[PDB]
Amino acid sequence: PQITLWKRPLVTIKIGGQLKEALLDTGADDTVLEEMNLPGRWKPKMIGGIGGFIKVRQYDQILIEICGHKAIGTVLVGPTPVNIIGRNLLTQIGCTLNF
Amino acid sequence: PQITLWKRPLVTIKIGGQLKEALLDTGADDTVLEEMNLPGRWKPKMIGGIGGFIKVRQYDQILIEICGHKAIGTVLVGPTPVNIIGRNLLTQIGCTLNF
Numbered sequence: 001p002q003i004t005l006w007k008r009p010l011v012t013i014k015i016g017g018q019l020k021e022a023l024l025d026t027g028a029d030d031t032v033l034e035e036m037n038l039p040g041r042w043k044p045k046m047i048g049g050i051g052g053f054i055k056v057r058q059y060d061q062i063l064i065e066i067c068g069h070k071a072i073g074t075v076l077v078g079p080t081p082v083n084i085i086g087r088n089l090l091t092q093i094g095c096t097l098n099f
Numbered sequence: 100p101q102i103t104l105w106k107r108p109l110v111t112i113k114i115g116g117q118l119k120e121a122l123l124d125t126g127a128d129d130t131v132l133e134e135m136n137l138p139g140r141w142k143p144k145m146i147g148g149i150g151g152f153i154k155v156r157q158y159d160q161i162l163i164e165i166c167g168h169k170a171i172g173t174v175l176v177g178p179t180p181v182n183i184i185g186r187n188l189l190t191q192i193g194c195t196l197n198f
């Protein structure tokens with residue numbers, strides 16, 4: 001699909017059974033979701049942005065569906081106000097910027 | 100151009116005759132540049148990111164060139180760690196996400 005940028009690029013995702021809304025974010029290195037439980041072990045990580053840093057939990061090899069496109073990669077979980085799909089998963093679904 | 104996302108989408112921009120590196124960022128409503136000097140009057144704005152909120156200076160009707168594409172619009176200036184080209188300007192240059 002082609003997604004214009006007049007409004008926030010919000011899409012439906014599926015992860016761990018649940019359907020969520022997330023932002024397709026070319027300015028995020030990593031994918032960060034609001035608090036939830038995921039399978040497997042985790043390790044702490046600090047991530048930074050506008051306003052400073054937050055502590056998140058890192059889960060690896062997580063399956064995700066983004067607009068019906070499946071992908072696998074690292075997912076971070078923590079106190080983010082918005083679900084963020086970062087470049088680590090954007091590449092897997094074949095997402096590019098075009099102008 | 101078509102920009103893939105294996106690396107950060109960092110491009111050259113030009114503002115006030117100066118070249119800078121900036122991040123093409125679909126997860127940013129607004130364009131926010133690192134501390135610098137612009138002409139004209141500014142008004143206050145607060146913007147939130149992953150780590151909390153920052154205070155920035157809002158300048159309107161600013162000339163900025165993004166990868167050779169001219170845009171004229173709102174530019175915020177403040178304590179961002181990176182120059183960010185947000186949706187307000189991505190739309191002007193005709194940028195879309197595609198997969």
Ligand SMILES: CC(C)[C@H](NC(=O)[C@H](C)NC(=O)OCc1ccccc1)C(=O)N[C@@H](Cc1ccccc1)[C@@H](O)[C@H](O)[C@H](Cc1ccccc1)NC(=O)[C@@H](NC(=O)[C@H](C)NC(=O)OCc1ccccc1)C(C)C
Nearest residue numbers: 025027028029048049050052081126127128147148149180
């Ligand atoms: C999501 C993170 C993994 C991502 N960071 C990174 O990729 C990494 C690894 N960090 C990294 O390189 O950090 C360098 C650094 C160094 C020192 C200090 C701080 C940071 C990130 O924050 N990326 C942002 C850009 C950026 C990149 C590097 C460094 C600094 C900023 C945007 O792409 C991005 O998408 C965020 C996501 C977001 C959206 C909405 C809310 C919160 C977060 N949007 C933004 O930060 C923009 N905000 C917005 O568009 C607005 C208006 N926010 C908003 O709605 O705020 C609601 C809010 C409510 C309550 C609390 C906080 C916010 C901002 C650039 C203009």
Ligand SMILES: C[C@H]1CCCC[C@@H]1O
Nearest residue numbers: 015016017063064065
């Ligand atoms: C298995 C888990 C990962 C994404 C697709 C469906 C589900 O929620």
Ligand SMILES: [K+]
Nearest residue numbers: 098099193195
């Ligand atoms: K386009």
Ligand SMILES: [K+]
Nearest residue numbers: 094096197198
């Ligand atoms: K594509």
